[PDB]
Design an enzyme around this catalytic site. Structure first.
Site, PDB file in Angstrom:
ATOM      1  N   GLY A  17       1.794 -29.007  20.685  1.00  0.00           N
ATOM      2  CA  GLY A  17       0.517 -28.837  21.372  1.00  0.00           C
ATOM      3  C   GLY A  17       0.578 -27.886  22.562  1.00  0.00           C
ATOM      4  O   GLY A  17       1.663 -27.418  22.928  1.00  0.00           O
ATOM      5  N   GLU A  20       3.188 -25.814  27.274  1.00  0.00           N
ATOM      6  CA  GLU A  20       3.428 -26.060  25.851  1.00  0.00           C
ATOM      7  C   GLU A  20       4.351 -27.260  25.590  1.00  0.00           C
ATOM      8  O   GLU A  20       5.109 -27.671  26.470  1.00  0.00           O
ATOM      9  CB  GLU A  20       4.019 -24.801  25.214  1.00  0.00           C
ATOM     10  CG  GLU A  20       4.150 -24.850  23.706  1.00  0.00           C
ATOM     11  CD  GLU A  20       4.738 -23.567  23.143  1.00  0.00           C
ATOM     12  OE1 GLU A  20       5.527 -22.900  23.857  1.00  0.00           O
ATOM     13  OE2 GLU A  20       4.412 -23.224  21.988  1.00  0.00           O
ATOM     14  N   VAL A  21       4.280 -27.816  24.380  1.00  0.00           N
ATOM     15  CA  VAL A  21       5.114 -28.965  24.004  1.00  0.00           C
ATOM     16  C   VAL A  21       5.812 -28.772  22.656  1.00  0.00           C
ATOM     17  O   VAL A  21       5.171 -28.552  21.632  1.00  0.00           O
ATOM     18  CB  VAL A  21       4.310 -30.288  23.988  1.00  0.00           C
ATOM     19  CG1 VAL A  21       5.091 -31.374  23.270  1.00  0.00           C
ATOM     20  CG2 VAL A  21       3.965 -30.733  25.413  1.00  0.00           C
ATOM     21  N   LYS A  36       8.241 -30.873  27.098  1.00  0.00           N
ATOM     22  CA  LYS A  36       7.155 -30.167  27.766  1.00  0.00           C
ATOM     23  C   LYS A  36       7.724 -29.021  28.607  1.00  0.00           C
ATOM     24  O   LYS A  36       8.545 -29.230  29.523  1.00  0.00           O
ATOM     25  CB  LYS A  36       6.354 -31.141  28.638  1.00  0.00           C
ATOM     26  CG  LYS A  36       4.992 -30.645  29.145  1.00  0.00           C
ATOM     27  CD  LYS A  36       4.466 -31.609  30.218  1.00  0.00           C
ATOM     28  CE  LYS A  36       3.070 -31.256  30.722  1.00  0.00           C
ATOM     29  NZ  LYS A  36       2.574 -32.264  31.720  1.00  0.00           N
ATOM     30  N   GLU A  77       9.430 -39.105  25.515  1.00  0.00           N
ATOM     31  CA  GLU A  77       9.339 -39.796  24.243  1.00  0.00           C
ATOM     32  C   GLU A  77       8.241 -39.137  23.415  1.00  0.00           C
ATOM     33  O   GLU A  77       7.221 -38.719  23.949  1.00  0.00           O
ATOM     34  CB  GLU A  77       9.068 -41.290  24.448  1.00  0.00           C
ATOM     35  CG  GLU A  77       7.778 -41.615  25.212  1.00  0.00           C
ATOM     36  CD  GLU A  77       7.642 -43.102  25.549  1.00  0.00           C
ATOM     37  OE1 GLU A  77       8.345 -43.935  24.926  1.00  0.00           O
ATOM     38  OE2 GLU A  77       6.829 -43.432  26.438  1.00  0.00           O
ATOM     39  N   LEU A  78       8.471 -39.020  22.113  1.00  0.00           N
ATOM     40  CA  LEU A  78       7.561 -38.301  21.233  1.00  0.00           C
ATOM     41  C   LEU A  78       6.403 -39.175  20.779  1.00  0.00           C
ATOM     42  O   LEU A  78       6.587 -40.362  20.497  1.00  0.00           O
ATOM     43  CB  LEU A  78       8.306 -37.786  20.007  1.00  0.00           C
ATOM     44  CG  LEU A  78       7.404 -37.026  19.042  1.00  0.00           C
ATOM     45  CD1 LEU A  78       6.772 -35.851  19.778  1.00  0.00           C
ATOM     46  CD2 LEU A  78       8.151 -36.558  17.799  1.00  0.00           C
ATOM     47  N   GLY A  82      -0.262 -37.650  17.745  1.00  0.00           N
ATOM     48  CA  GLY A  82      -0.983 -36.541  18.348  1.00  0.00           C
ATOM     49  C   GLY A  82      -2.073 -36.922  19.345  1.00  0.00           C
ATOM     50  O   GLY A  82      -2.125 -38.067  19.850  1.00  0.00           O
ATOM     51  N   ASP A 122      -7.581 -36.117  35.596  1.00  0.00           N
ATOM     52  CA  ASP A 122      -7.788 -35.231  34.465  1.00  0.00           C
ATOM     53  C   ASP A 122      -7.756 -36.014  33.135  1.00  0.00           C
ATOM     54  O   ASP A 122      -7.123 -35.595  32.170  1.00  0.00           O
ATOM     55  CB  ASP A 122      -6.760 -34.078  34.490  1.00  0.00           C
ATOM     56  CG  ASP A 122      -7.138 -32.919  33.563  1.00  0.00           C
ATOM     57  OD1 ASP A 122      -8.341 -32.637  33.385  1.00  0.00           O
ATOM     58  OD2 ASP A 122      -6.218 -32.294  32.997  1.00  0.00           O
ATOM     59  N   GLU A 126      -7.689 -34.962  25.191  1.00  0.00           N
ATOM     60  CA  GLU A 126      -6.501 -34.115  25.043  1.00  0.00           C
ATOM     61  C   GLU A 126      -5.261 -34.720  25.698  1.00  0.00           C
ATOM     62  O   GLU A 126      -4.136 -34.382  25.340  1.00  0.00           O
ATOM     63  CB  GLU A 126      -6.745 -32.726  25.643  1.00  0.00           C
ATOM     64  CG  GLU A 126      -7.857 -31.931  24.980  1.00  0.00           C
ATOM     65  CD  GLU A 126      -9.239 -32.255  25.526  1.00  0.00           C
ATOM     66  OE1 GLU A 126      -9.563 -33.447  25.737  1.00  0.00           O
ATOM     67  OE2 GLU A 126     -10.018 -31.305  25.734  1.00  0.00           O
ATOM     68  N   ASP A 143       0.035 -36.038  30.986  1.00  0.00           N
ATOM     69  CA  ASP A 143      -0.448 -34.947  31.860  1.00  0.00           C
ATOM     70  C   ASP A 143      -0.823 -35.362  33.272  1.00  0.00           C
ATOM     71  O   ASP A 143      -1.992 -35.305  33.657  1.00  0.00           O
ATOM     72  CB  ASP A 143      -1.637 -34.224  31.229  1.00  0.00           C
ATOM     73  CG  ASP A 143      -1.219 -33.269  30.140  1.00  0.00           C
ATOM     74  OD1 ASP A 143      -1.336 -32.046  30.362  1.00  0.00           O
ATOM     75  OD2 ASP A 143      -0.783 -33.735  29.065  1.00  0.00           O
TER      76      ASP A 143
HETATM   77  O1  LWH Z   1       4.386 -36.198  22.565  1.00  0.00           O
HETATM   78  C1  LWH Z   1       4.136 -36.008  23.907  1.00  0.00           C
HETATM   79  C2  LWH Z   1       4.839 -36.704  24.880  1.00  0.00           C
HETATM   80  C3  LWH Z   1       4.566 -36.489  26.234  1.00  0.00           C
HETATM   81  C4  LWH Z   1       3.593 -35.580  26.637  1.00  0.00           C
HETATM   82  C5  LWH Z   1       3.309 -35.358  28.097  1.00  0.00           C
HETATM   83  C6  LWH Z   1       3.660 -36.218  29.156  1.00  0.00           C
HETATM   84  C7  LWH Z   1       3.236 -35.652  30.337  1.00  0.00           C
HETATM   85  N1  LWH Z   1       2.630 -34.431  30.014  1.00  0.00           N
HETATM   86  N2  LWH Z   1       2.684 -34.273  28.664  1.00  0.00           N
HETATM   87  C8  LWH Z   1       2.894 -34.886  25.659  1.00  0.00           C
HETATM   88  C9  LWH Z   1       3.225 -35.039  24.307  1.00  0.00           C
HETATM   89  C10 LWH Z   1       2.390 -34.344  23.287  1.00  0.00           C
HETATM   90  N3  LWH Z   1       1.383 -33.549  23.770  1.00  0.00           N
HETATM   91  C11 LWH Z   1       0.539 -32.924  22.922  1.00  0.00           C
HETATM   92  N4  LWH Z   1      -0.492 -32.097  23.480  1.00  0.00           N
HETATM   93  C12 LWH Z   1      -0.797 -32.079  24.895  1.00  0.00           C
HETATM   94  C13 LWH Z   1      -1.899 -31.176  25.338  1.00  0.00           C
HETATM   95  C14 LWH Z   1      -2.053 -31.646  26.738  1.00  0.00           C
HETATM   96  N5  LWH Z   1      -2.077 -33.094  26.594  1.00  0.00           N
HETATM   97  C15 LWH Z   1      -1.038 -33.391  25.587  1.00  0.00           C
HETATM   98  C16 LWH Z   1       0.696 -33.112  21.561  1.00  0.00           C
HETATM   99  C17 LWH Z   1      -0.162 -32.480  20.659  1.00  0.00           C
HETATM  100  C18 LWH Z   1       0.000 -32.679  19.294  1.00  0.00           C
HETATM  101  C19 LWH Z   1       1.004 -33.497  18.821  1.00  0.00           C
HETATM  102  C20 LWH Z   1       1.859 -34.124  19.712  1.00  0.00           C
HETATM  103  C21 LWH Z   1       1.704 -33.931  21.083  1.00  0.00           C
HETATM  104  N6  LWH Z   1       2.545 -34.542  21.936  1.00  0.00           N
END
Ligand code: LWH
Ligand code: LWH
Lengths: 287, 287
Positions: A17, A20-21, A36, A77-78, A82, A122, A126, A143
């Site tokens: 996503g 970037e991630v 991230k 952690e994953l 999504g 925020d 998303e 986020d």
């Molecule tokens: O699997 C995750 C684990 C932790 C975080 C994270 C923690 C603090 N910031 N971001 C994000 C992901 C994360 N983040 C995604 N998209 C973003 C766009 C902005 N909001 C989340 C994402 C999008 C698609 C599939 C898996 C994803 N996994």
């Protein structure tokens, strides 16, 4: 290329996503993680990191590792399921009971933040992640870049002396002070609306009223045909969250005690999902 | 006892004011200095220090040295004349032209702060120092502990996206944002009032109206007998500073262009005092 210290511990993989991630595998465990990447900024990162490191809740994302390099690398952690965003775009419709399961977790998470002097600022689809592709899963809030930490106000300190020299507007601000967290409750309101109805309450689609004017007036776009198929308890909670007056607006506590969430089945499914997540981590206990 | 590093460079002496401020002599020059001792806190000190180190104005106090020890030790240039407070207590009366000389320097100083994204927030007679016991002297503003640094607002950043999820009160706050500096102008207003009249405009002495109510209403205690001996230009400027509405309130620029300060004699005496202070420091120049 990726920093050597990152590479030492992880094999990097595809993008997930958008900073970037990326997907990655931890070498030690062969388990999937999320990484991230935040380009170079530092304040948002240092706070998110400081926040996530001190926070500990089933519906708040946990940090695993951090890399300060040519760029920022945060290892989380994953979340296989999504973004909640993907479940609500193109007027896609979440079934009411799924809304309740998700929103209930959202409320607990944000309640926890608030109990702990953290305001997210925020919250939107998303930044809400689903733990799997199941429709009944755990959600976690992510986020935390834009968040704010409540602390002993300069305002409080100012109130300790005599205002001989103190401007009128500071004194007036006392009436409304300490309700910053209410901005999160508005956001949850909007998120819930969107989940239930498949469309945004405030929008420029087919209106001559400015976005700003709809929001300050509190007049969301109510489409009876769409809402008709939705319960009246749900819409009622939405209405108590979309209150313009921040002091009158429902807090998370009030939201949690609202009839729409007095749903023992839902809480069961959630508790089920909890112990299920934790099965692999559970140590034996003194009985 | 005092830290060894302080003692190495200075002989400590009597107390001057109340943290606390002592007289001291710098060993290298045998010259008198002031040493501000702040017990152990760190935020106020780190900011004052970071501020005073970057600031450079004839009417802002300059820092000479700093000691981070069992306590905080800040070494400043000494102000022999003491606090402006002492000149106005016990209904003591500053002669109008002295008020103008002092206030004019106060305005330049605070204008400078504001041009530089600094808000003082604690301006009062106690934090205004006179450079000598002469009645015509330089004044310098001190005590920057409570100050705030303006910066790229989180508000500004928030305005860059669509407020789909954004709470009403944030949008409303846009109308009044960016006028925090006006609190300094109110304070100057109060300080000027006190200087001209020998008494405070807002006070609990002989009123049933609460201090808070006088301030928010803007209704200062006007005593004609005392003010009669005071010019009408002076009182007019006071009135433009004591404006409840922060957006209508006079800024420092407006105050500086007010007729009461269109006084060529006064500016001369000030310029005189300037080059006089600087006589001992002046290097020769390419002619
Ligand atoms: O699997 C995750 C684990 C932790 C975080 C994270 C923690 C603090 N910031 N971001 C994000 C992901 C994360 N983040 C995604 N998209 C973003 C766009 C902005 N909001 C989340 C994402 C999008 C698609 C599939 C898996 C994803 N996994
Ligand atoms: O001579 C000085 C040089 C620098 C500073 C200073 C700079 C930043 N903070 N304080 C203060 C003094 C200073 N400060 C005094 N009293 C305090 C009470 C709080 N406001 C000032 C003072 C009082 C009497 C005589 C001399 C004084 N000199």
């Amino acid at each position: 290329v990726y920093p050597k210290a990152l590479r030492d511990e992880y094999i990097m993989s595809k993008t997930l996503g958008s900073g970037e991630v990326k997907l990655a595998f931890e070498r030690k465990t062969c388990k999937k993680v999320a990484i991230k990447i935040i380009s170079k900024p530092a304040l948002n990162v240092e706070t998110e990191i400081e926040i996530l490191k001190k926070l500990n809740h089933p519906c708040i994302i946990k940090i695993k590792n951090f890399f300060d390099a040519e760029d920022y690398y945060i290892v989380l952690e994953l979340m296989e399921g999504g973004e909640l965003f993907d479940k609500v775009v193109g007027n896609k419709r979440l079934k009411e009971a799924t809304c309740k399961l998700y929103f209930y977790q959202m409320l607990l998470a944000v309640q926890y933040l608030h109990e702990n002097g953290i305001i997210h600022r925020d919250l939107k689809p998303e930044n809400v992640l689903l733990s799997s592709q199941e429709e009944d899963c755990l959600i976690k809030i992510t986020d935390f870049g834009h968040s704010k930490i409540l602390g002993e106000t300069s305002l409080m300190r100012t109130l300790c002396g005599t205002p001989t020299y103190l401007a009128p507007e500071v004194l007036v601000s006392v009436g409304t002070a300490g309700y910053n967290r209410a901005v999160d409750c508005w956001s949850l309101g909007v998120i819930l609306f969107i989940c239930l109805s498949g469309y945004p309450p405030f929008s420029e689609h087919r209106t001559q009223v400015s976005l700003k004017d709809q929001i300050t007036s509190g007049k969301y776009n109510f489409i009876p045909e769409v809402w008709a198929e939705v319960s009246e308890k749900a819409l009622d909670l939405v209405k108590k969250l979309l209150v313009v007056d921040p002091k009158a607006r429902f807090t998370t506590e009030e939201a949690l005690r609202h009839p729409w969430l007095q749903d023992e089945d839902m809480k069961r499914k959630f508790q089920d999902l909890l112990s299920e997540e934790n099965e692999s981590t559970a140590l034996p206990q003194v009985l």
